[PDB]
Design an enzyme around this catalytic site. Structure first.
Site, PDB file in Angstrom:
ATOM      1  N   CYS A 296      -7.728  10.640   6.662  1.00 55.94           N
ATOM      2  CA  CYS A 296      -7.572  10.407   8.096  1.00 55.94           C
ATOM      3  C   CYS A 296      -6.180  10.872   8.517  1.00 55.94           C
ATOM      4  CB  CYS A 296      -7.769   8.905   8.443  1.00 55.94           C
ATOM      5  SG  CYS A 296      -9.508   8.351   8.634  1.00 55.94           S
TER       6      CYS A 296
ATOM      7  N   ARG B  14      -6.350  12.883  12.268  1.00 57.57           N
ATOM      8  CA  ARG B  14      -7.608  13.445  12.768  1.00 57.57           C
ATOM      9  C   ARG B  14      -8.601  12.484  13.445  1.00 57.57           C
ATOM     10  NH1 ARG B  14     -12.011  12.350  10.001  1.00 57.57           N
ATOM     11  NH2 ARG B  14     -11.904  11.568   7.865  1.00 57.57           N
TER      12      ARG B  14
ATOM     13  N   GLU C 238       0.818  -1.223   0.000  1.00 54.49           N
ATOM     14  CA  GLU C 238       0.000   0.000   0.000  1.00 54.49           C
ATOM     15  C   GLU C 238       0.854   1.278   0.000  1.00 54.49           C
ATOM     16  OE1 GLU C 238      -1.876   1.608   3.502  1.00 54.49           O
ATOM     17  OE2 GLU C 238      -3.816   1.642   2.497  1.00 54.49           O
TER      18      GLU C 238
ATOM     19  N   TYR D 156      -4.236   9.118  -1.279  1.00 55.09           N
ATOM     20  CA  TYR D 156      -2.908   9.578  -0.942  1.00 55.09           C
ATOM     21  C   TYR D 156      -1.882   9.726  -2.048  1.00 55.09           C
ATOM     22  CZ  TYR D 156      -4.802   9.178   3.727  1.00 55.09           C
ATOM     23  OH  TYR D 156      -5.558   9.344   4.867  1.00 55.09           O
TER      24      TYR D 156
ATOM     25  N   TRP E  88      -8.430  -1.295  -0.400  1.00 57.72           N
ATOM     26  CA  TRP E  88      -9.214  -0.232  -1.022  1.00 57.72           C
ATOM     27  C   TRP E  88     -10.368  -0.639  -1.927  1.00 57.72           C
ATOM     28  CZ3 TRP E  88      -8.141   4.832   0.431  1.00 57.72           C
ATOM     29  CH2 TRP E  88      -6.996   4.972   1.239  1.00 57.72           C
TER      30      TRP E  88
ATOM     31  N   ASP F 230      -8.870   4.532  14.671  1.00 56.29           N
ATOM     32  CA  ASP F 230      -9.531   3.349  15.213  1.00 56.29           C
ATOM     33  C   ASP F 230      -8.425   2.652  15.982  1.00 56.29           C
ATOM     34  OD1 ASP F 230     -10.387   0.658  15.587  1.00 56.29           O
ATOM     35  OD2 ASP F 230     -11.530   0.661  13.734  1.00 56.29           O
TER      36      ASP F 230
END
Ligand code: U5P
Ligand code: U5P
Ligand code: K
Lengths: 316, 316
Positions: free
Chosen positions: B198, B218, B60, B146, B82, B221
């Site tokens: 995130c 921000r 990733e 990203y 994704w 989990d």
């Protein structure tokens, strides 16, 4: 005491701070990554161990809240914090006629003959911006500063985003949102900026009817800057809570590079020998609620009782 | 042990965490503002108290480094992280013909009959993206993720900024820069996004020939997400240090909202009863240096010896 986290950050940079060189060519002791919180229910974080000018922090934040980018409003309030940036443009303009002001910064801090002529041109600059409407509009407008980034972010399709106005509506409609973020960092402007914003972004958070805010600051001048930075954002946290009918929580100040210039050592050591007094109280106009239409008179600081101001050289 | 800060963050959210409701309509215990650091010289922060799939974090991040935004590269590496986002577009497209997949998320987590048909359409979706070039180009491309934000930020004058490529050159030419920032938060795209990033932004820092990085997240989990988030950014800190001929420092992970879903309680409590083993070692290809042209084979994790994986439900 409430301001202890600041005093602690000053100590930490003194002991563990690594000598790191800086842009101004002045040395600095630095640390990367730090975080302090201030419980706003215990008082307002304006330092008592040193006198900080609240009127300066107040008038400047309002200037931001209005989305204003013109020095004119600041000067009308005897706020010269941004004069330097505007004055530079004047000087490097083809219509500027007067003494050479090349690197007036660390040239005024040296030569007293120059420093004197420097305070002349500037005195004149401030007078024209204040009375000549077309002058103000051309050299008095900074363009890309916080007021514009917060309230009029430029889009690629030629429009402007009121970041802050939009987020405030989000707190009203979705208090539990984890996306209540306001950025001031624009990748396309940053490389051409003389000063990419120091206060990169902030995030609001609500829980149990209390509003909190976290600020991410990329670079910070522990001695001269931070005392102000804390008051501005704790103040902003207060204004938004007021507008959103919320209670205040904490102000979390996160740092990237936190530094202390080498010429602020004796002063920082002196402040540290002082004993914090109880924090002041902030009082806001209960009748007015639209914080974008707030004026100096609507915000009042009660019971601020500081130690004398500590003078220190600015790094340039 | 090296991963202690994570275990500590899990405990803190357990004791002090305030029940706060969330988007997925699953509950959460939350805290606002937290910061932990990992000294990368003491080892790689891949948790040993629970087995984390490094191949997923590795493939990733590479996908990110290439500036790629197409699911195709991920699927070729058996990386389905994704798929969901791409699959949604397919489903809501006028050329989609098959069973109703409205809210396939918390519908699959319920009905086993649906969950089964769901894994069919998706299996087909993944096959078309993998073999049909025009299909992949239309539904396999996410666009704003990203890779694009880091390596091809869109400007208002129709160009693209290689944020990350530019900052890396800045570390080479101005190590002591306090402006080594990469943002992924764009005010003009965020309101139309299904998932505003995130991982909002990160900042590099160099001192004493050691590179460090601070990440501002921000929302997080604590249980399922954070173990991955740590490894991705500690990994990125390693790749950039490698390219810049620097040594590694620390990875500082700063949080806005850090939460633990209500259905991860027993699992988080179980992981906590485990005793950290020594952290693994990351080893990078010494011959290759352009990190943008790195492949799976160039990064190798030595001595990872984890406890069994802990299964938990995803919140939707
Ligand atoms: O209110 C402010 C404004 C600026 N700075 C500092 O101003 C300098 C800006 O330059 P740079 O190091 O960020 O590039 C840094 O010391 C920072 C503060 O701490 N507070
Ligand atoms: O790698 C990741 C990706 C996502 N999240 C989480 O995914 C959800 C995204 O939605 P929101 O709450 O940010 O709006 C949040 O729990 C966060 C993580 O912790 N790590
Ligand atoms: K940004």
């Amino acid at each position: 005491m409430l301001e202890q986290p600041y005093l602690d950050l000053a100590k930490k940079v003194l002991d563990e701070g690594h000598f790191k060189p800086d842009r101004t060519h002045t040395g600095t002791y630095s640390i990367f990554g730090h975080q302090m919180r201030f419980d706003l229910s215990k008082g307002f974080p304006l330092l008592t161990t040193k006198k900080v000018p609240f009127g300066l922090i107040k008038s400047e934040l309002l200037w931001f809240l209005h989305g204003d980018t013109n020095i004119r409003f600041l000067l009308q309030h005897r706020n010269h914090i941004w004069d330097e940036w505007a004055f530079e443009k004047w000087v490097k303009s083809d219509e500027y006629h007067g003494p050479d002001m090349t690197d007036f910064g660390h040239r005024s801090q040296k030569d007293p003959e120059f420093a004197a002529v420097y305070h002349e041109e500037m005195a004149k600059f401030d007078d024209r911006v204040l009375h000549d409407d077309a002058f103000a509009a051309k050299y008095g407008d900074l363009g890309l500063v916080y007021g514009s980034q917060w309230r009029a972010w430029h889009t690629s399709k030629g429009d402007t985003i009121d970041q802050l106005g939009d987020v405030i509506e989000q707190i009203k409609t979705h208090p539990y949102s984890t996306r209540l973020i306001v950025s001031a960092w624009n990748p396309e402007d940053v490389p051409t900026m003389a000063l990419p914003p120091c206060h990169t972004l902030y995030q609001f958070y609500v829980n149990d009817g209390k509003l909190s805010l976290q600020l991410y600051q990329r670079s910070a001048d522990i001695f001269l800057g931070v005392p102000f930075n804390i008051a501005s954002y704790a103040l902003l946290t207060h204004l938004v809570a007021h507008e959103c009918g919320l209670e205040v929580g904490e102000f979390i100040h996160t740092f990237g590079d936190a530094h202390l210039y080498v010429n602020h050592l004796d002063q920082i050591k002196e402040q540290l020998s002082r004993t914090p007094r109880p924090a002041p109280t902030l009082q806001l106009n209960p009748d007015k609620h639209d914080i974008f239409d707030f004026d100096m008179k609507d915000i009042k600081l009660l019971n601020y009782d500081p130690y004398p101001a500590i003078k220190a050289p600015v790094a340039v």
